[PDB]
RNA sequence: CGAACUUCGCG
RNA sequence: CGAACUUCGCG
RNA sequence: CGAACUUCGCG
RNA sequence: CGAACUUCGCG
């Protein structure tokens, strides 16, 4: 099934033995895993989606290209990058099972992988890797993927505790009127925080963030 | 001293859009039209990868748990301003407002290279061997010294010799298991603190005890 | 820069 | 071989 | 990189 | 011979 996978991605490798080093994990060999390809790729696939990042985002401050960032090389995008490679049907492990963790470390070996195999030519392997993905990429830049929020996160525990959403309450406003400062107060069930902010949702996903803990901390 | 063309000179590369290099060197402050940031955040990237190919080909050691440290040490602002220093850098740094530091130096370092990887067509070949030809000695150098960032025993005794002029002290509380998988108990101590550390060997256990010690120190 | 020492990293 | 702390010497 | 003590494991 | 730890030597 090697030659499946090199059709997927479009290239057919000139030493298999390194390929196959790539899709095994730890456990199936102690001496042979992708642990070292594993560190190449994450920094080669790192510099492949900035690559894109920076030309692609509506917006280019660091401010904005942080957290779109942040999901683009998250374990998430990666392995909707690797389904598109039905990667996890040629990944070789011994003990238990495959994770999400897994596919993505092997989908940074891959890359690796190419890389070195191709005569460590960044250049042909930038190309083949946006071939794939330069599409599913510019989409997710454009759409404003980012990682879920904490108001976002506390429904969804409150939701699975008490099948019910928090409630957020405005308890001050100070300040001048362009320079106003926030206090919410965020509630579930007979847990209260307060949050402060430049605006009522910020100061929301402060109240929200330390009532999450408050809450998984009983 | 402060002429492009110099700093050309020193990289080895000649640029055919010189605008490209100037907002590399230059600060929010000088020009908040266009600076470097937007480079800087590309240059970190590529950088990043130079240094990991180098990394992962002449470590000694393949394993992940030592490759860390030294990626650790060969990103850091210190070591962009060792090779900074190389290029005589800080002197074509356009600044407006504050003083030139070592972030600075450092995020310029990267914009650098985001601005040459630009110029030359976006081509990581090109701009990964030029970056090479300047640096590669000097990171395998560091490779091969094990240079990486100061280890916790280290930190503290420096923090407690700062504050009471004296070095910390270790004791050896307990040792346990087969003589194939011994388990350290230690404790660390300055003063009126001190902490436990556990590990597989006395070192590692001093290395956690010294660790605690430090956030205890931080606290008070 | 040089010397001693303390702690640490790599081979 | 390499890094830093302290100290003395030296500039 | 190297020597030895203790222990475990493979032949 | 391989591995873990302890002490030590050289760079």
């Known amino acids: 099934m090697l030659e499946q996978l090199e059709k997927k991605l479009g290239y057919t490798f000139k030493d298999k033995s390194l ?3 790539a899709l095994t994990h730890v456990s199936y060999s102690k001496k042979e895993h992708y642990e070292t390809l594993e560190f190449l790729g994450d920094a080669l696939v790192n510099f492949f989606i900035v690559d894109l990042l920076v030309q692609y985002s509506p917006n280019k401050r660091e401010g904005f290209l942080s957290p779109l960032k942040a ?16 990667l996890h049907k040629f990944i070789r492990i011994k003990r238990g099972k495959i994770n999400e963790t897994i596919i993505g470390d092997v989908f940074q070996a891959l890359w690796a992988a190419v890389y070195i195999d191709s005569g460590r030519d960044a250049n042909f392997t930038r190309e083949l890797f946006y071939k794939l993905f330069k599409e599913d990429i510019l989409s997710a830049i454009k759409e404003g993927r980012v990682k879920k929020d904490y108001k976002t996160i506390l429904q969804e525990i409150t939701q699975k505790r008490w099948k019910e959403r928090p409630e957020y309450r405005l308890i001050s406003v100070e300040g001048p009127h362009h320079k106003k400062k926030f206090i919410v107060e965020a509630k579930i069930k007979e847990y209260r925080t307060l949050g402060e902010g430049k605006s009522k949702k910020e100061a929301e996903q402060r109240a929200a963030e330390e009532l999450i803990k408050l809450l998984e901390e009983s």
């Open 71 to 86: 999901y683009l090389i998250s374990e998430e995008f990666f392995n909707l990058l690797a389904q598109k490679l039905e």
């Open 19 to 21: 390929l196959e080093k």
